[PDB]
Structure formats: C-alpha cells, structure tokens
Design a protein around this nucleic acid. Structure first.
Ligand SMILES: [Mn+2]
Ligand SMILES: [Mn+2]
Lengths: 437, 437
RNA sequence: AAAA
C-alpha cells in the first residue's frame, strides 16, 4: 500500500495543472484528474481533451484516474459523482490542487476530500498555483514553493496541451532567407543591424514607404512579370516631380545604398547607384530571380530576423534551448481548423511570451496586430501568457496602444507590452528586461 | 437586530457580483465586499476600484463593509486578514457568493465563515452564478434560480463597473449622417436597403473596392486638398482604358447610380453619368463639403446604419430600450486612456453582445477585426460577453474565421459569431436568433 | 491559474 494520490481539477487552462503535476509527479503514486462532461442543456462543455493531454504529456499512464463530473456548478451532482467515482483504495496522503475548475468544483471537492481522507487521519493537503508570483502554496503545511525557474515547458508541449498540432518553427540555422540569399545573408543582416543600431530605423522605414514600396509594390506578381513592372516603372516616370524613381536614384541615403549593395549582385535592386530597370531582354523568370526575394526581405522580414538575432544573445547565456523555448516563424493549427503564425515565440519557464513584429507607424494597423498577439498567446499559452508588440510607432503612440488594449487580470505586471521604433536598437535588451523581470 | 449579511468576493470580472447583488439586495441589510490590496512585489493589483463601483451602483452606502485581503494567493494570510478584519457583529444569516475571486479565496473564506458562524443562531448559505446556464445555484440546496431574464443592466452601468467613462452613443434619432445628408438620408438609406435586400451586397462591395476606393481613397488626405485629387484623377487617367475613372463612368451598375444620385445635389460624387472631376478654382474646403462626408458614409458607414435599422425593429418588439440596452457608435475611455469604438452594442439581460461591422471580403482584415471585437467586449462587458463580426466574406470564410479565433471558455454556446455576406439581407432575424437563443 |  502506502499509495499517495494527487487530485487535479482540470479546467479550460491546462498549463497550471501541467506545472504542478511536473513538480509533484515523483512524490505521488496515483493521479485523479477531475474533468467535466458535455451537456448542451446546461451549456457546459467538457474539459476531457485537456485531461487526456495532461495524462499524455505528464506521462501518468495507467497510474492516472479520470473522474468525470456531470454538472460543474451543481453542488449535489458534484459530490454525488465524487463519492461514486473517487477511488475506493486506501491512501496515506491525499493531495488536492484546486487551482483549476469552477469555484463550485473547487469548494465541493476540497471539503469532500477533507471529510473523506482527512476524516481518516490520512495526510491531506491543498495547493494553488499563484499566476502572479509563480508559487505553489500549501494550505496546511504553509509552504510556498516557487516553480518559476524549476518547471520548464517547450513549444510543442505547450501547444499540444492547448489542443494545437502540427507545430512548425525555424531556427538560427534554418531561416528561410538564409537560403534565398545564400552566401550573402550574413552580410545583408550585418549591414542592416548596423543601421538599426545607429538609430536609423525611422529613416529606413520612411525610405521603405517611398520609394521602395512605391516602385516594388503594386499589382500582384508585379515583380514576377516584367510587363507589369515595365508599365509600372514608366507610369512612375510620368509623375515627373513626384516620381519615386527620381528619389530612389538621387535622394536615397547612403546607409540604404550600403544595405542594397550588400545583397548579391544577382539579387540587387540597384544598378550601381540607380534603379535597375529591366530591358525587353529580361524575362519574367529573370525578374523574380533578382527582385522578388530581395523585395520580400526588405518589406518587413528583416525586422523579424533582427529582433530574433538581437535576443538570441541573452537567451543562450540564460541556457534556454532553441526550438524548445525560443524560435521564429511559429505555425500550428487546431484539428480541421485554420493555421496561425507568430513571428517570435519565447518561453520563460512556463510563461509564453509571444512577440508580433511590424515596421508600421500606423495606429490602426498596429492596434489590430496587438489585438491579434493577445488572442493567440491566450489560445496558445493560456490566460496568463504575455504578448509584446514591437512597432515602428513613436513612444507616445506605443504607450497609448498599451493603455488602450490593457485588460485587468489581477497582476501588476503588464502582459501587453508595445515597443516603439526607438526601442529597435536595444530591443534585445528591452525584451530581456521585460521578459525576465 | 437580525442582521443578515451577504459576502461578495470581488475579482477582476465585476459583472457577476452586480448581478447577484441586484437580486439579493432586498433580503439582506449588510454587505461585505472582500477586495484585494495592491502589492507590486507579489505582482498583485487591487480590485478595490471594482468593489467601489459595485457599492455605488448597488447603492449600499453604509450597509457596505470593505475587507482588504493583503495576499489573494496565500491561504494563511487570507484567513489571518479575515479574522482580523471580518465584521464581528451579530448576524443571523451569512450568505456568501463565491462566484468571484481567486480559488484560494473562494475556499478559505468559505470555510472561515462556515466555522465562525457554525452556531445555529447563525444560518450559513452559499451561492454561485453559473455563467453557462445563467442561474444562481445554492450550495446544498437543489434550488435553481435563473437570473438570465430577471436581472437587466444598462450600457452606462456595465461600462462603469468595468472602469470606463465618457460613455457616448448615437441612437436612431441622432445619427450623425442623418444630420449631414439633410433631406436625403432616408432616400440614401432606402436605396441601400432596397439593393441589399436584392442580393446586391457583393455587387456594391466590389464596386466599393474598384473603382470607388481607387478614386476617392487613394491618398491620406486627397479629399481635403483639391490638388492631390486632380493629381490622383490624372494619375489614374494615365492608364486610359482600364483606369478606375473609366469603370466609374461606364461599367457602373444602375443601383449604384440610384444611390449616388440619392445624395444631396451639392454632395454627390458624380456629375451626371460621369465622375465630377474637380476643376481649378475649387477650394479645398468646397471639395471637402462635397466628397468628404459622402465618401465616408459610402465606404461602409452605410452598413452600420443598415444593420442598426434591421435590428432596431426586432428589439423594440422585445423590451430592449434604445440607448439603455442597444445602440450604434459607442465610444468610451478609461481615465487617461484612449477611447474605443464599437460599431453596434446590445445587452440581452446582463450579457453584452458587441457587433463589429465590416464590408470586406478579405480574410486578413476581417480576422483582425475579430480580435478587436473579442478584446473590446471583454474589457467593456466582462469575460462572458459575446462578440459578433458581420463580414462580407462567404460562408466558407466565415466558418473558417469562426474556428480560427474561437477560444475555449467552457460553454457549448459560441461567443464569437461571424456572419457573412449572404446573411446581410436577413441580418435582422439572424441577429435576433443568435442573441436571444 | 481573480463568473472553469
Ligand atoms: Mn508580423
Ligand atoms: Mn467597422
């Protein structure tokens, strides 16, 4: 005998159970996962899919007992099913983690176990995981254990316990544009990093709006069909005074030219110090081989590799593993449901920090992109996950956004942090400070 | 003499305590609002402002006692602060609503009061408001009191208990564009309503994309400067055929011309069957008085008035009161925080149904508008608010968006509803269905 | 994990 059992209340947030289970798996022998059933008459769904995922990812196997509850808000039907379905075996210690579930479930499961085992002088203990100071507090023993730097979770386990699948991500050694600009990516990335670190981001993004996007963006497949481009180029020449081609050749700053001249000669958007305008001998395949990949990277993809490279320094010194706790280009889906894409993911302990990146200074576009990162990390990491939005907006607008999209969760620490264009140079440090503090 | 007390555990969601308080305020002469203090060192904010608002709108005044809990995660510190600060007065019935607060609070308060009032001179009772079935279940009593159709909240009170101020909404008799298009708004709306009922939505939207949003919405202030515009007109005219100007003058369906000519004479975008092309000596203020308000209302505001008029009738049949339970163009702010804008608001009992309207068929733009309406109704009405996003997408895209952004709250009823283009003509009954099921 |  001498069996020790752990009773977990399984709600719609599975992460708090996973953390407590990992910390107490060894010191207990059997596990009771109290979940819920589906009853559309009472508008109640089931937390069983989370209970299956908690059994699998904690690897409790057959040492796990599933206790179903028919009504999560009916005191009578809770205690009824409890006596009829709680294990009849003897135990030396009965530990309850009432962190999840309803309040009804919590109240009636706590008092029932208190009067079924603690009534038999069998060790009884309650526990609740603080989502604010990251501690597991014991009711009777009065112990407060911080599981912040002890319990660790990865991106695959975190999304699977939240019922997401097909988890794809990229690494420092598997970035897509490392292949598109092979034997030249480091040079292009180094040059851009210099300018952004030199507080030239506002100037770069301005140049990206005019003329970069005035010339290289328009009709779909503008840069994959020469005819569309050549017609587009001639139309811009007709604008004369307001022509972006004139501004590209003449008013383009030098740090831009250095970035452009960093691209491989076969994939340069410039003809020395002027805009490369293809002739009638240049085919549609030649254009995409030179313009498409370079334009896509300068349209916002550089800002993603920048932030990921800026933060990679502090992370490797914090002994965090790549592909497990940090990565880029995160994609996943629910079964028979559309996919999602998060620019940068980062997991400090078990707190998921989702980072969405945009080079925009427009209020509406940044606000919606913040809206998105809040909801994704909610569906992906839980209701206690952080969302940081890095934008090209100024400090004032950035601050307003944080205030506008702020939701009271009971924690002084903010879960929605917006970073402005000024923070770009030291974004790596600014994030490290935010995430680890 | 016989002081019956009701104890409410105050959390971040204040709506449940207001609902229960409004129902049981008459049968109790004392009220204890257990609220949290602010200790930044333990990452814990104060729900005092939420409990303050409840005392005001429930008009408890002197019958209200405030009990500050220093730590809302430590069992020991909870009970210690309780014994130290709970009213030591004589009570004949002690009723606890444990629907809110942290799990630890709901269990340790429950059992602290249950023992402090075990003497049969004092009768103990416990309540919980089930958000799923909208009922007030009583502990140990099979009694089931539904409050779905009994308790009703006004839009000003709901935003006030969630800490928002400067609540401004427009109703039927005070629509802004009804004052801007004088003696024509009824004819403009009639033509738009008539066309939508004739399955001409997609038609309008496609014309709104091209050539409408290519002639009047190409530059950030082209309808505020006559030069930019005539420049924009000539820049489109450079294309000759396939220019947005030609499609307007030629390939423009008749029901569009009917709406365009329904506008007041001095505020029409057309000059016969052609696009009035502003000539020289047209002031940037004379241009504004003609195209500015017409372009804005024709860019989508029309969809907001359409949906509002279709729902207005259904609701009046019911008891919903305009301005008190439904309305259009709601704006409000938290103190020293930016304002928000929800297109249409509705309150079915005490449930906030927020409706965001967009005439777009693009999945990205609609997706983003979905994250917005979800986050807004949770800040404005609480975590049990429904969001509805009436898009211009087809049934396939709507069901995909509905699955992409859906979060698991624990209810078998949807809380994010994505109506599509085909639902437009019967949006009145469609909304009546989803809101009052 | 402060109306699951
Ligand atoms: Mn992005
Ligand atoms: Mn809208």
């Amino acid at each position: 005998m001498n069996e020790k059992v752990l009773v977990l209340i399984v709600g719609t947030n599975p992460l708090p159970n996973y953390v407590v289970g990992s910390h107490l798996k060894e010191k207990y022998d059997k596990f009771v996962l109290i979940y819920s059933e589906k009853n559309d008459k009472i508008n109640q769904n089931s937390t069983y899919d989370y209970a299956k995922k908690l059994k699998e990812h904690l690897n409790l196997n057959d040492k796990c007992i599933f206790l179903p509850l028919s009504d999560v808000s009916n005191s009578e039907k809770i205690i009824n099913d409890l006596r009829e379905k709680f294990p009849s075996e003897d135990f030396v210690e009965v530990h309850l983690n009432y962190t999840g579930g309803t309040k009804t479930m919590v109240v009636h499961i706590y008092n029932f176990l208190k009067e079924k085992f603690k009534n038999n002088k069998i060790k009884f203990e309650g526990s609740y995981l603080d989502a604010r100071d990251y501690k597991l507090v014991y009711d009777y023993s009065e112990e407060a254990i911080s599981l912040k730097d002890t319990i660790k979770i990865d991106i695959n386990t975190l999304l699977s316990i939240h019922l997401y699948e097909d988890i794809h991500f990229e690494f420092y050694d598997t970035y897509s544009y490392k292949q598109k600009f092979v034997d030249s990516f480091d040079k292009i990335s180094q040059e851009i990093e210099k300018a952004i670190k030199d507080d030239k981001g506002e100037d770069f993004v301005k140049w990206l709006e005019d003329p970069f996007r005035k010339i290289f963006k328009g009709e779909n497949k503008l840069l994959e069909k020469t005819a569309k481009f050549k017609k587009h180029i001639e139309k811009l020449l007709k604008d004369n005074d307001s022509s972006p081609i004139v501004k590209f050749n003449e008013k383009t700053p030098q740090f831009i030219w250095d970035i452009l001249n960093a691209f491989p000669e076969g994939k340069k958007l410039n003809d020395g110090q002027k805009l490369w305008i293809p002739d009638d001998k240049i085919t549609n395949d030649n254009l995409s081989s030179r313009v498409k990949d370079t334009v896509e990277f300068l349209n916002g993809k550089w800002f993603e590799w920048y932030v990921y490279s800026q933060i990679k320094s502090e992370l490797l010194d914090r002994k965090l593993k790549e592909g497990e706790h940090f990565g880029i280009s995160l994609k996943a889906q629910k079964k028979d449901s559309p996919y999602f894409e998060l620019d940068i993911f980062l997991i400090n302990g078990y707190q998921l920090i989702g980072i969405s990146l945009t080079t925009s200074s427009t209020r509406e576009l940044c606000k919606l992109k913040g809206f998105e990162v809040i909801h994704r990390v909610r569906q992906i990491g839980g209701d206690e996950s952080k969302a940081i939005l890095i934008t090209g907006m100024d400090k004032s607008k950035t601050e307003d956004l944080q205030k506008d999209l702020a939701y009271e969760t009971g924690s002084t620490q903010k879960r929605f942090v917006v970073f402005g264009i000024d923070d770009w140079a030291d974004i790596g440090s600014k994030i490290c400070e935010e995430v680890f503090k």
